[PDB]
Design a protein around this nucleic acid. Sequence first.
RNA 1: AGGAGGACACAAACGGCGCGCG
Length: 51
Amino acid sequence: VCAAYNADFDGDQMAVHVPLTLEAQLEARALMMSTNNILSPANGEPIIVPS
RNA sequence: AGGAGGACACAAACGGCGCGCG
């Protein structure tokens, strides 16, 4: 996943938000889950390119 | 003798300057 975030682990801060309501949980699991974003929307190129 | 009477509630903010990190 670190490729998608452009996340180098050299002291990189990152934020967490908790979806509260039912629809928020379902929307997260259906649209924003890691396994639902294996293709880049900018071109037909995987974002899970091996590290 | 008889007889008569008699207090509930209530938890810290806004603008600069500087530095630093992603």
